[PDB]
RNA sequence: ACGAGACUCUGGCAUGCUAACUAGUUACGCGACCCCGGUCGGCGUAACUUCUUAGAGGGACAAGUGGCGUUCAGCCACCCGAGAUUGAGCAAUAACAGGUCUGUGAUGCCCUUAGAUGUCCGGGGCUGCACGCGCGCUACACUGACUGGCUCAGCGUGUGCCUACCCUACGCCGGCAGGCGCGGGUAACCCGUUGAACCCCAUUCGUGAUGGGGAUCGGGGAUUGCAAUUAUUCCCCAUGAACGAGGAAUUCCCAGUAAGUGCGGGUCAUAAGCUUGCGUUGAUUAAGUCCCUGCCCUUUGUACACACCGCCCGU
RNA sequence: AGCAGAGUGGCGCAGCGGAAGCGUGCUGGGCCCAUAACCCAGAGGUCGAUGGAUCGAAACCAUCCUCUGCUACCA
């Protein structure tokens, strides 16, 4: 129990990123780019895994079920308003992206804005603020 | 001026368990802070070990609080 | 140095005016307890009362003015 | 791994030391004696200069070492009062040379210690006692009795092997003295 | 004679006075639960002002005692005592080349007056960034962060003339921001006994730029308005940067005070990091000085008087 | 053509195993009613280059380059 179990995996290699095993499973999975604190509790509530265990002693079948909940969260009855990427301009699907679709889709959206020549794209290309705030007094780390 | 970044173990290895079971009930004041300092473990891990020792009956309760708890050894007589 | 001066404790008799550059010091008239006839003046920092006994590390100096 | 340079835990009065300054306070300033295992010291504000200063960091220069003289020490309590005003200009070169010999002896013995893999406070003090403090007490000089001993022992292995520390550790120390001290 | 004082408002008490179904208290009956007695901001009605509301009067004056003082003005400590220095309002002569012609159908002179410096419509701008400065907000954590439960206020405001735009209990739908038919208040009656926050208790976290910190940025959904793009605002999930208690210097304050913490009003169709009020928790230090920065009075000095930020000598 | 010194912030310089500083120049802030003096902070560094010893060199090793101190066209 409180004694370290056998084959206690220290470093977890999940989705070509580095994950510590010493952290709580509700917080060690938050180190993956794209997933945060709030959506982590839902995933470990759909899967029958308690929140009182560390990430370093879980095994292949439960972490494989959690990876299935990562990749296909829709048919495990996760509500549609809980997602980060909804109502796509390319195909119109509800999906959750985990750092690869997230990074390449953010890059594709930024080049889409730069190609479409909207002023949001021009401000992202120039390297300024887009949400419409004052630049006169702040943003002093822009350029030398 | 040595840094010595502490890397506390998240669970007990072999030597920590019997070191605790032989030395912690032989100390005057027991709190999870001084257990984490002497035995280089985590704060919550010390709390779980102290709850186990309280359930075993080798430690008496003094006062409980949401900030810290106070534990002491048994009388040697 | 090489000499341990024994600590003597003295009680005030009358408070004088407040000395110092900013007026933070005070002149007091202390008296010794091993022989209650001797009265010297010392510089004190802080509020003092009448009948307030003070500890003295040395018993040889005399009180100087604001400078 | 670190310890004191010489065998004395705290230096005597009227002794020159080179000290590393750490922070500046109101009544004094917090420093660290690099040759006495970074113990707490105090330099006085009026003792920094004999003439009128214009700023505190004219003579503070946080992070750079300086030369001081111990005015009053307390061996039982661990307090050393330092002095900056009472120093001669001719003492700086000799203090720097003594610190150079002490720091190269400490670096050579630290290298030999990490080769020999002896990581303990008491064992490291025993290695210092069997390596440098024995010849320091033999030559009756706190610092000047060591660097001349390594300079002689670089050419005299019989003088090198006079201390009965070990065999393989003695060979490693002789190799380090031959390679470094040339 | 003016100024100070004197005067007014507010706080601090009075079981004495006047009074209350738009404020309650105490008794009585009924009803509900439990083990003979407790709870009811449940229902209803016989006295009363103990709580509340606000009117008139009272009370503190150096009044007493012991000292200091020319024993004169006054000062110090103590007892009885709700207070033996509560806070604000008003605030003199003289002048400033102080600010306001963008508060005014208060205003002299000047400019302009039909291709207008009047006026109106549509769009934009006042927000645009190598950089510097001021007022402020959030933090740099374990005197803590998150999650549940327990639990306590006071100032206020509210359906407007052209002027349409109010505050809200209650029921359903939806995670939420929100939406519809329903009832009250033109106000001590309704929101409302304003179930406020900080605090209190119990888990989770364990010195790790970490579950601190929430900047930047992507996608989606509602509200206001004719109209949001240079995101009005709000909500949901992601994104998690700097920042490890801050150099020279400098601001405010001494008692319910600083500080922490939230709630009202002003702007308001949409609306507070500002301001003005209010309440809760609640300290450290000091009863002094003229050293710094300045102020009041007397004496003295002056080659100054648009007045030392003055005047003035020489290459 | 031969032997030695120096190679470090725009400029001059200290340094030799645990490790980018000094004086000066520039920029900004404070102090003051303002300026000059005074104080604070920062930018600015292949430490001339090559390969190697060493856990680790701007320094140790061999070479070259640039400017100087002495011989000078020595057939």
Swiss-Prot record, chain A:
UniProt keyword Transmembrane, yes or no: no
InterPro entries linked to this entry: Rbsml_uS13_C, Ribosomal_uS13, Ribosomal_uS13-like_H2TH, Ribosomal_uS13_CS
Modified residues (N-acetylserine): 1
Gene3D superfamilies: 1.10.8.50, 30s ribosomal protein s13, domain 2
In-chain residues carrying the UniProt-annotated modification N6-acetyllysine: 93, 105
GO terms under biological process: translation
Family statement: Belongs to the universal ribosomal protein uS13 family.
Keyword Ligase in record: no
Known partners and oligomeric status: Component of the small ribosomal subunit.
Role of this protein: Component of the small ribosomal subunit. The ribosome is a large ribonucleoprotein complex responsible for the synthesis of proteins in the cell.
PANTHER family the record matches: 30S RIBOSOMAL PROTEIN S13/40S RIBOSOMAL PROTEIN S18, SMALL RIBOSOMAL SUBUNIT PROTEIN US13
Cross-link Glycyl lysine isopeptide (Lys-Gly) (interchain with G-Cter in SUMO2) placement: 90, 93, 105
Keywords assigned by UniProt, alphabetized: Acetylation, Cytoplasm, Isopeptide bond, Ribonucleoprotein, Ribosomal protein, RNA-binding, rRNA-binding, Ubl conjugation
Family annotation (HAMAP family): Ribosomal_uS13
Main localization of the protein described in the UniProt heading: cytoplasm
Localization per Swiss-Prot or TrEMBL: Cytoplasm
SUPFAM superfamilies: S13-like H2TH domain (SSF46946)
Organism: Oryctolagus cuniculus
NCBIfam families: PRK04053.1
Protein name according to UniProt: Small ribosomal subunit protein uS13
GO CC terms of this entry: cytosolic ribosome; small ribosomal subunit
Coiled-coil regions listed: none
Pfam family, one: Ribosomal_S13
Name of the gene: RPS18
PROSITE patterns membership: RIBOSOMAL_S13_1 (PS00646), RIBOSOMAL_S13_2 (PS50159)
GO molecular function: rRNA binding; structural constituent of ribosome
From Swiss-Prot, chain B:
Protein family per UniProt: Belongs to the eukaryotic ribosomal protein eS25 family.
Description of how the protein assembles with itself and partners: Component of the small ribosomal subunit.
The entry's keywords: Acetylation, Cytoplasm, Ribonucleoprotein, Ribosomal protein
Any single biological process term in GO: ribosomal small subunit biogenesis
Full-length numbering of the shown residues: 38 to 114 of 124
Protein name (Swiss-Prot/TrEMBL): Small ribosomal subunit protein eS25
Compartment(s) where it occurs, according to its Swiss-Prot or TrEMBL record: Cytoplasm
Function: Component of the small ribosomal subunit. The ribosome is a large ribonucleoprotein complex responsible for the synthesis of proteins in the cell.
Swiss-Prot record, chain C:
Keywords, in A-Z order: Acetylation, Cytoplasm, Endoplasmic reticulum, Nucleus, Phosphoprotein, Ribonucleoprotein, Ribosomal protein
Matching PROSITE patterns: RIBOSOMAL_S28E (PS00961)
Compartmental location: Cytoplasm, Cytosol; Cytoplasm; Rough endoplasmic reticulum; Nucleus, Nucleolus
Entry GO CC: cytosolic ribosome; cytosolic small ribosomal subunit; nucleolus; rough endoplasmic reticulum; small-subunit processome; synapse
GO molecular function, one term: structural constituent of ribosome
A Pfam family that the UniProt record links to this protein: Ribosomal_S28e
Positions of post-translational Phosphoserine modification: 39
BP GO annotations: cytoplasmic translation; maturation of SSU-rRNA; ribosomal small subunit assembly
Domain of life: Eukaryota
InterPro entries xref list: NA-bd_OB-fold (IPR012340), Ribosomal_eS28 (IPR000289), Ribosomal_eS28_CS (IPR028626)
Task of the protein: Component of the small ribosomal subunit. The ribosome is a large ribonucleoprotein complex responsible for the synthesis of proteins in the cell. Part of the small subunit (SSU) processome, first precursor of the small eukaryotic ribosomal subunit. During the assembly of the SSU processome in the nucleolus, many ribosome biogenesis factors, an RNA chaperone and ribosomal proteins associate with the nascent pre-rRNA and work in concert to generate RNA folding, modifications, rearrangements and cleavage as well as targeted degradation of pre-ribosomal RNA by the RNA exosome.
Family the UniProt entry places it in: Belongs to the eukaryotic ribosomal protein eS28 family.
Protein name as catalogued: Small ribosomal subunit protein eS28
Swiss-Prot record, chain D:
Compartments (UniProt record): Cytoplasm, Stress granule; Cytoplasm, Cytosol; Mitochondrion
The keyword RNA-binding is assigned to this record: yes
Chief location category: cytoplasm
Residues included from the entire protein: 4 to 185 of 315
GO biological process: cellular response to amino acid starvation; cellular response to heat; cellular response to oxidative stress; cellular response to UV; HRI-mediated signaling; mitophagy; negative regulation of translational initiation in response to stress; PERK-mediated unfolded protein response
Descriptive protein name: Eukaryotic translation initiation factor 2 subunit 1
UniProt similarity note: Belongs to the eIF-2-alpha family.
Induction: Up-regulated upon endoplasmic reticulum stress.
Ranges where the S1 motif domain occurs: 14-85
Positions bearing N6-acetyllysine: 138
A single GO cellular-component term on record: translation initiation ternary complex
């Amino acid at each position: 129990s409180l004694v370290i179990p056998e084959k206690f995996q220290h470093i977890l290699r999940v989705l070509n990123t580095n994950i510590d095993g010493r952290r709580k499973i509700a917080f060690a999975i938050t180190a993956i780019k794209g997933v945060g604190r709030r959506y982590a509790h839902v995933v470990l509530r759909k899967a029958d895994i308690d929140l009182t265990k560390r990430a370093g002693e879980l095994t292949e079948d439960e972490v494989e079920r959690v990876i299935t909940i990562m990749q296909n969260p829709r048919q495990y009855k996760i509500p549609d308003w809980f997602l980060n990427r909804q109502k796509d301009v390319k195909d119109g699907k509800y999906s959750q992206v985990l750092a690869n679709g997230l990074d390449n889709k953010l890059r594709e959206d930024l080049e889409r804005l730069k190609k479409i020549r909207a002023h949001r794209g021009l401000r992202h290309f120039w390297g300024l603020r887009v949400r419409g705030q004052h630049t006169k007094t702040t943003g002093r780390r822009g350029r030398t | 001026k040595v840094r010595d970044k502490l890397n506390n173990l998240v669970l007990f290895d072999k030597a920590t368990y019997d070191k605790l079971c032989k030395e912690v009930p032989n100390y005057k004041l027991i709190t999870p802070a001084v257990v984490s300092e002497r035995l280089k473990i985590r704060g919550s891990l010390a709390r779980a070990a102290l709850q186990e020792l309280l359930s075993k009956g080798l430690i008496k309760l003094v006062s409980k609080h949401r900030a810290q708890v106070i534990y002491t050894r048994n009388t040697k007589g | 140095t090489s000499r341990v001066q024994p600590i003597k404790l003295a009680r005030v008799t009358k408070v004088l005016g407040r000395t110092g550059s900013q007026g933070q010091c005070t002149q007091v008239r202390v008296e010794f307890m091993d022989d209650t006839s001797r009265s010297i003046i010392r510089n004190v920092k802080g509020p003092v009362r009448e009948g307030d006994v003070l500890t003295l590390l040395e018993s040889e100096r005399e009180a100087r003015r604001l400078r | 791994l670190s310890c004191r340079f010489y065998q004395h835990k705290f230096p005597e009065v009227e002794d020159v030391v080179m000290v590393n300054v750490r922070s500046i306070a109101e009544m004094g300033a917090y420093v660290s004696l690099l040759e006495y295992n970074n113990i707490e010291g105090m330099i006085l504000l009026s003792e920094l200069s004999r003439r009128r200063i214009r700023s505190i960091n004219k003579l503070i220069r946080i992070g750079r070492n300086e030369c001081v003289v111990v005015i009053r020490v307390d061996k039982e309590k661990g307090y050393i009062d330092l002095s900056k005003r009472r120093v001669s200009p001719e003492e700086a070169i000799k203090c720097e040379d003594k610190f150079t010999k002490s720091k190269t002896v400490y670096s050579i013995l630290r290298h030999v210690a990490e080769v020999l893999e002896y990581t303990k406070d008491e064992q490291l003090e025993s290695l210092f006692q069997r390596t440098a403090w024995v010849f320091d007490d033999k030559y009756k000089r706190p610092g000047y009795g060591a660097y001349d001993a390594f300079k002689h022992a670089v050419s005299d292995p019989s003088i090198l092997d006079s201390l009965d520390l070990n065999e393989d550790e003695r060979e490693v120390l002789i190799n380090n003295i031959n390679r470094r001290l040339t």
